[PDB]
Amino acid sequence: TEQRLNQDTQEAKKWEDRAKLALTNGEENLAREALARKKSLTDTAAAYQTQLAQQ
Amino acid sequence: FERMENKVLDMEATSQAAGELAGFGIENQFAQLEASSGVEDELAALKAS
Amino acid sequence: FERMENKVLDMEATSQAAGELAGFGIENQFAQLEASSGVEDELAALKAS
Amino acid sequence: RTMSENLRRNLAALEAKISEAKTKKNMLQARAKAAKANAELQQTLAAAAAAAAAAA
What we know:
This is part of a larger assembly, with 4 copies of chain A.
Chain A lengths: L1 H22 L4 H27 L1
Family (chain A): Belongs to the PspA/Vipp/IM30 family.
Organism (chain A): Synechocystis sp. (strain ATCC 27184 / PCC 6803 / Kazusa)
Protein name (chain A): Membrane-associated protein Vipp1
């Protein structure tokens, strides 16, 4: 679970960058999409922290 | 020719009726709205940068 | 000649429709942006030299 | 050309949730393996306590 956690905490930063790269092109319709991808990664990363601390 | 024109018009109306009626319903009818994505708040926060 | 012109126009529209529709989707639609590479930060750092 | 816009939005709204499902399944399969490892451990600990070799 420690390996999985480190993947998703860096995959989210990829999508955070790609969102800002869309707003500088004004393409809000695409920035919202990248933010939606980020959200579900942050939500599941919190599940690993809870699981790992218990284990 | 007259008899076969009427079959075409029956096909067309049957197809349009089902598609029009399938155009109703909340999931489709909301999918036509631009801000439906639900991330508008964090977009507004990002726009603070 | 008139009958065979219409076949050509049906081929052309079929080809264009699929390619246009395949032009959508995040992976393609982001591939058209120059800074999509994700290494812009370390490029900016290298530009400090 | 009103139908084609409607379909083209519906088509994007599907793949957006194939992406969500595919990230959740990874976290759920992880949890399913962990839960099953602990079940086998707790079963082993109970069987050992039922033998009570230390009491014999």
